[PDB]
Amino acid sequence: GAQVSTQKTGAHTIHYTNINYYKDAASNSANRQDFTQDPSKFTEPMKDVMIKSLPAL
Amino acid sequence: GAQVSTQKTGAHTIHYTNINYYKDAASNSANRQDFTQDPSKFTEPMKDVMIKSLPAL
Amino acid sequence: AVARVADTMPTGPRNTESVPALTAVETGHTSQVVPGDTMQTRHVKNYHSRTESSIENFLCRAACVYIATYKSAGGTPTERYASWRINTRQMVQLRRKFELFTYLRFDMEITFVITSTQDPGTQLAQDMPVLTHQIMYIPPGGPVPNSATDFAWQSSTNPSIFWTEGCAPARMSVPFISIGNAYSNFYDGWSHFTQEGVYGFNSLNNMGHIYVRHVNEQSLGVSTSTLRVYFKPKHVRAWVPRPPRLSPYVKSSNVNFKPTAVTTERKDINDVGT
Amino acid sequence: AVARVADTMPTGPRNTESVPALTAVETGHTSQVVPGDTMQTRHVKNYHSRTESSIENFLCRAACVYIATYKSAGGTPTERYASWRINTRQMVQLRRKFELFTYLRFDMEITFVITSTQDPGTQLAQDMPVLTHQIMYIPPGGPVPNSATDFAWQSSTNPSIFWTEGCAPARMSVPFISIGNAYSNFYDGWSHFTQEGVYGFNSLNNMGHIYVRHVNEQSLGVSTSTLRVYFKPKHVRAWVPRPPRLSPYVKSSNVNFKPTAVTTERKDINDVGT
Amino acid sequence: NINSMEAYRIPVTGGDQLHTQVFGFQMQPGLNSVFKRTLLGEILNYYAHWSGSVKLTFVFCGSAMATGKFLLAYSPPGASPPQNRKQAMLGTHVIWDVGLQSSCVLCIPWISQTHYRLVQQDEYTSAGYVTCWYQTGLIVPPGAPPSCTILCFASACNDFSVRMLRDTPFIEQTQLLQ
Amino acid sequence: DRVRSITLGNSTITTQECANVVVGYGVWPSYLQDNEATAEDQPTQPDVATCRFYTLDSIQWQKESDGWWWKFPEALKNMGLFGQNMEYHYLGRSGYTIHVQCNASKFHQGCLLVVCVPEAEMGCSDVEREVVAASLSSEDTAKSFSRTESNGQHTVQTVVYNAGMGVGVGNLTIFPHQWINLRTNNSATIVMPYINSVPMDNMFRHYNFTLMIIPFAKLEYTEQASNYVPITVTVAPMCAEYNGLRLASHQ
Amino acid sequence: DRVRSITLGNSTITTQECANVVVGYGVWPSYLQDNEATAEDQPTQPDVATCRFYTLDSIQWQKESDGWWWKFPEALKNMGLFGQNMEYHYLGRSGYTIHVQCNASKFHQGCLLVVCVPEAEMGCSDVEREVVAASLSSEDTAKSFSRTESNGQHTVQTVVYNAGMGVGVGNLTIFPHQWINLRTNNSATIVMPYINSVPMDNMFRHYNFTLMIIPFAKLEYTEQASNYVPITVTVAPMCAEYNGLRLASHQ
Numbered sequence A, B: 001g002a003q004v005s006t007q008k009t010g011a012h013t014i015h016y017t018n019i020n021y022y023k024d025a026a027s028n029s030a031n032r033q034d035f036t037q038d039p040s041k042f043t044e045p046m047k048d049v050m051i052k053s054l055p056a057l
Numbered sequence C, D: 001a002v003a004r005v006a007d008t009m010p011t012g013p014r015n016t017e018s019v020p021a022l023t024a025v026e027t028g029h030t031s032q033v034v035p036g037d038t039m040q041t042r043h044v045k046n047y048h049s050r051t052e053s054s055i056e057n058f059l060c061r062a063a064c065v066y067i068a069t070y071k072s073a074g075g076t077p078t079e080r081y082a083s084w085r086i087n088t089r090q091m092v093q094l095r096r097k098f099e100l101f102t103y104l105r106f107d108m109e110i111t112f113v114i115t116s117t118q119d120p121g122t123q124l125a126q127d128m129p130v131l132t133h134q135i136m137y138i139p140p141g142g143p144v145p146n147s148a149t150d151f152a153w154q155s156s157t158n159p160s161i162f163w164t165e166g167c168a169p170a171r172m173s174v175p176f177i178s179i180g181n182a183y184s185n186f187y188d189g190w191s192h193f194t195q196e197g198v199y200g201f202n203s204l205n206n207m208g209h210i211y212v213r214h215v216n217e218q219s220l221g222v223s224t225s226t227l228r229v230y231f232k233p234k235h236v237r238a239w240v241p242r243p244p245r246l247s248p249y250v251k252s253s254n255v256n257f258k259p260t261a262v263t264t265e266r267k268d269i270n271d272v273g274t
Numbered sequence E: 001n002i003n004s005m006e007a008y009r010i011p012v013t014g015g016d017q018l019h020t021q022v023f024g025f026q027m028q029p030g031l032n033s034v035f036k037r038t039l040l041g042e043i044l045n046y047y048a049h050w051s052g053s054v055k056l057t058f059v060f061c062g063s064a065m066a067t068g069k070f071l072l073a074y075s076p077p078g079a080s081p082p083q084n085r086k087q088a089m090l091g092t093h094v095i096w097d098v099g100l101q102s103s104c105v106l107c108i109p110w111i112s113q114t115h116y117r118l119v120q121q122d123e124y125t126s127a128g129y130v131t132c133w134y135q136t137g138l139i140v141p142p143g144a145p146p147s148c149t150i151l152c153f154a155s156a157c158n159d160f161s162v163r164m165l166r167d168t169p170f171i172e173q174t175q176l177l178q
Numbered sequence F, G: 001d002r003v004r005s006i007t008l009g010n011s012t013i014t015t016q017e018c019a020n021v022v023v024g025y026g027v028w029p030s031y032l033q034d035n036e037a038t039a040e041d042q043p044t045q046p047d048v049a050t051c052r053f054y055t056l057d058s059i060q061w062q063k064e065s066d067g068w069w070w071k072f073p074e075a076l077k078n079m080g081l082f083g084q085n086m087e088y089h090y091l092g093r094s095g096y097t098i099h100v101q102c103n104a105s106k107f108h109q110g111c112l113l114v115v116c117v118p119e120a121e122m123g124c125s126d127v128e129r130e131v132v133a134a135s136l137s138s139e140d141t142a143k144s145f146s147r148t149e150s151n152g153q154h155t156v157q158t159v160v161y162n163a164g165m166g167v168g169v170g171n172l173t174i175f176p177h178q179w180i181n182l183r184t185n186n187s188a189t190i191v192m193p194y195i196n197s198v199p200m201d202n203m204f205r206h207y208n209f210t211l212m213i214i215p216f217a218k219l220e221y222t223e224q225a226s227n228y229v230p231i232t233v234t235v236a237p238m239c240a241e242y243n244g245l246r247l248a249s250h251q
């Protein structure tokens, strides 16, 4: 039950504890530490992979 | 005492903790996660087992 | 997982002697025909569940069962406290949900919501401390208080809860306290062996009374209060399901009714519009 | 660490055929040119992060969505309680943040902030107990209360929360309760298959109502109260980002507008001053 | 017919036939005059959302010498309701031959774009119509009753689901019952 | 056994007094192989939207009736999406399943012959002339036979004992046939494969086969009984595919 | 490279000055899996007869022009057999491929923005009212933008810099877009997948996405040159499937 996770500190006793008390997944706290990203779907939505140094046309 | 059980999430840190504080079984929380069923007593209350593909009469 | 629903297996065309649609209701049998017997279906993975439709998720929601008012005045000592023979028949929203089943066995949480006001007239209060209420449960046969400030409000064995106004509502748990093995919602019978007396469930209801009062005199004015009792049945097992009721209730001790129509009317038998 | 930004690698002079600055926007492509392609840079270790700019850190902040007032008077029973068809369109600060995305799927915490006062006039109270409020959620199709002190305030199946004044605000959690698989903020279509009816998202909003009342009569005077509902979406996934809105909103059920200028004016095209 | 036993019975008759519908109703198991008061529709009014496939079983309660064939159609809600058997044969339909086995299950599939439908439906989550038409007609021998009676049944399949409990808009009160 | 059920597409057909299923000349309807195909382009294959049961119009078996015929696939011109692919595609190839149902009583009597005649070329009534297309097959109704000789100048010779072709009507039992005897039988189902000399053919200028229903033993009853005995025809295409997509014609 | 060719069905599209192919939000159009499907019955899948290139009407890029829009799939209502399956089936699900072509010269100049806007909800011109369906999308022609404010009572607000939605017209570049620069480019092809909140939807009461063509840099030329520069739009459905076959409506 003790899900020991790390706190938020800036890169130049950092762990916290969290218990799920209620029987529903919507009762939990916010998922504030999921930091994935994939910007290639909007920046490079091409069929062919485009190289920077190679010319486009 | 720590009865670690799973939360409720939809199929496409999910565990919670529960302690019984009081000395009586009626003091507990609700049994919201007992999902058994047996609908054959009202749908098929027959003496002989009836097959779908075989004719009834 | 638990407790999901069945998937529809994929189906092609067919020309068989094994017809599953043709059946016979005369045997008293509900058919097990899934849509794959009468048409071509596709393989879907049904991820729905029936967790919200179980017995415990259906009944574990608190519902009001009584509304009782009482004063803090002088004179008419019947108004200085309230009474309730314990029922699940006076408020309809919980009465109809219980009466889909014949028998019931459960535990319970009981929440008291008390909400006061100041009574009008001359010689008002203008500075009052908080109010405190005593909610005594009397098992069947105990000493009934005739008024407030009585000897029966000591409650050396009757369970009583004292509650000041402004805090969270009072709440306790109660086990399965019946004499038999199930709370009979319906009782087709009598009370005396000579087939005389009280026909119905009112002879089986022997659960006791509930008394609520102000433990404080005040000494200046009157303040009415309204006790609302809430029932949440937990650890519920139920047997012998009944049809839901059609006609509206009339009495709190009877299944007496007036004959109502089976549905609401419509214009034609073939009325697919509009 | 996660989720930091890219470092600028050091760069010297160059004379190449591989020019990275010259590109072509006609392909619909945003260039990946870092500053090391057009000038000489130095090796810095960028320790910044994008934790504050994620979807969950952007939307998990509570915002007001409604302001509802109700009385405790006598007469005009529509003022004795308040109603709300549940929207995220009436208050603009949360409406604009949602409408940067087409679809949304999340859970929610809902906080109720109730703040009362004493209504003027003759025959005031001068000694009142605390107030208590019942905030009933009615899923779509349920029994609507016509006034306060109604049979529909029993709520045997509707979730209700009772809250005395003076304590912490009431708060509960709500799952993803939509029919589909995402809360559609935009719906380019109709309600009937004949391309008639209600154009827009107002046909997709079937979430139910919210009713709030005083559970206490008082019996002397009037006290108004103001319910403020707060929405915090958590466990948020979002799809298909939209441009942010330019013209101010007019209606709570439309994207209707009046045509506004694209920016604010300035004196000249070459206006580096002052 | 709602204050009698005749609400549950469907009239079928003799000559000639088949330019007439047998019955017809919308597919709305929680909000309809037809089958919101049945066993399926009473539990549906305790919930807001529903899903799954619904069965309809039809018993022929005529004489044992009467023949007949019927068309039991179901139509998705995309277009207008059918007015004859040429428009009703294109939807999901079965053909029921009345014989030694006197029942036929027309199993309405779950065709929608959403995973759930509302119980109190609207123009968005409409499900369509259920019609019935004469295929051939009743042929009875001399000395037999010329008209018969069909009964309709409704239940759920094994992939039915409900969600979002609410109070029913079916029972009311004004004061406390004494 | 006497109970069957034929499920194709989103439609089923249930019977309770069945003779059997005659299946063409032995073979089952299938798709065109790569060994025999001559159209170069990719064929379309709508499984559920085309191969399903279509109920045609109903006729009335009177006591003086003599026969009817339907020409296929022209009878399913305005039947659903099967008729919409015929207009848009120049080529077509399909097998069928012909369910014909007529229930009367234990007290009625009669007999029918349900044949499927491939390439049923029909003769005119005025010799040294030629029929027109409006006299060979109606839009959805049945073209009937006449007990006497047909006098028309551009109609089919609809005499019944020559079967409209010049052959003996008793010798029609070579073709895939059943009999609806009202004493023993209730319905008649016939599964016909694709019978042609070419691998595919345009299904506007070539009636592939003709369905004929002819009462050999006529219908009689008693005045207490019913006096309306109808016949219903329900035909499903099977393994249908098309080629040559162009503009719709007609229309 | 600048030369491409897109072959779908019995139709090809050849270009010789191409930018690239923008493919939606990354993904390719596909069929509905068994993991996500909710319709119980078997779906139809016409490969060649439905998924092919359809050429819409042609417009005229004038020197004072400001923009147009088409709403899909309502623009292909009477386009072949794709529009015939929409009427017969209650459900539909498809991806698209939007080829927009406009060749002028080495001496003309101009620019266009070809966006595909999912769920492009559009605002009325008379506020405190509502649009009608005849003002949102014509039967085959293009609905155009206006340079000034629209005065109508039941029309779309067709002002161009608010893009008919209330947003900035420069910020439309989030959506899958190309640019037809007449200096470097000749055509613009965009492959859009199926974007919806539900797995399938009825394609009569729900415009899935709107195609907008807006000239940011206008068209100018010299009097020696040509004075008719048209734009042609060619849209092919991709991986289309349907459910819920009933009678045709409408019609």
Ligand SMILES: CCCCCCCCCCCCC/C=C/[C@H](O)[C@H](N)CO
Pocket (backbone or CB within 6 Å): C086, C087, C088, C104, C108, C110, C134, C135, C136, C137, C159, C160, C161, C172, C174, C177, C183, C184, C185, C205, C207, C210
């Ligand atoms: C002041 C302390 C109050 C303590 C509260 C306990 C009083 C309530 C005890 C009785 C409640 C048990 C549940 C009763 C259910 C119904 O009687 C059955 N449905 C009818 O048989």
Ligand SMILES: CCCCCCCCCCCCC/C=C/[C@H](O)[C@H](N)CO
Pocket (backbone or CB within 6 Å): D086, D087, D088, D104, D108, D110, D134, D135, D136, D137, D159, D160, D161, D172, D174, D177, D183, D184, D185, D205, D207, D210
């Ligand atoms: C008295 C107890 C009150 C219980 C509170 C629950 C009521 C609120 C339920 C609805 C909230 C769900 C979130 C709704 C979001 C918007 O409707 C979507 N953005 C629009 O589709």
